[PDB]
Amino acid sequence: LGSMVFERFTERAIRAIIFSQKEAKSLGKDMVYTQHLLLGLIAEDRDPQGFLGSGITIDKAREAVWSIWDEANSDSKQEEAYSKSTDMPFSISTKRVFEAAVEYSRTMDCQYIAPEHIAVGLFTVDDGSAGRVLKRLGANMNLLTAAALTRLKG
């Protein structure tokens, strides 16, 4: 995407990002926080074995998210202050993740930022939101990070 901020992001990565916006909107949100990004990544991944081969699926992930943030008290950490769904802004935590993804990709001497780089970012530099969802799903976040790194090897 030439001389865009997302120029080096792959087609898959961009799709996951757009999906994060859609997922957030479905939940009645006006900004994409990191749990939403997690949803976008899950929605995007076409692995037949589920997200990062984990058996996680989007419907289950969506239930978890709704439950955690919407069925009881709201999250004090997510009150940061759009005419179509792809104009929905990203939270400071989410932006941090994207920056981490870029950094990791550069460190690895990769030409692109893939969803896997975003996942590594998500699972290393976020506000704890992704972890809460994974915990609810019974998943091990560090194993998922490893799986993402494994994918990037080919």
Residue 145: other Cβ atoms inside 10 A: 18
Closest CA to 46 of 16, 24, 91, 3: 16
What is the C-alpha to C-alpha distance for residues 26 and 23, in angstroms, rounded to an integer? 5
Q: What angle do CA 19, 21, 27 make, to 5 degrees?
A: 105
> Six-digit token pair at 91?
């939270």
What is the C-alpha to C-alpha distance for residues 113 and 133, in angstroms, rounded to an integer? 24
Q: How was this structure determined?
A: X-ray
Q: Which amino acid is at 98?
A: F
Residue 147, H or E segment = helix 141-153
Closest CA to 144 of 33, 49, 32, 75: 49
The rounded Cα 141 to chain-centroid distance in angstroms is 13
**Domain boundaries, given as residue ranges, for the chain:** 1-154
First-to-final CA distance of the chain: 24
Residues in the chain: 154
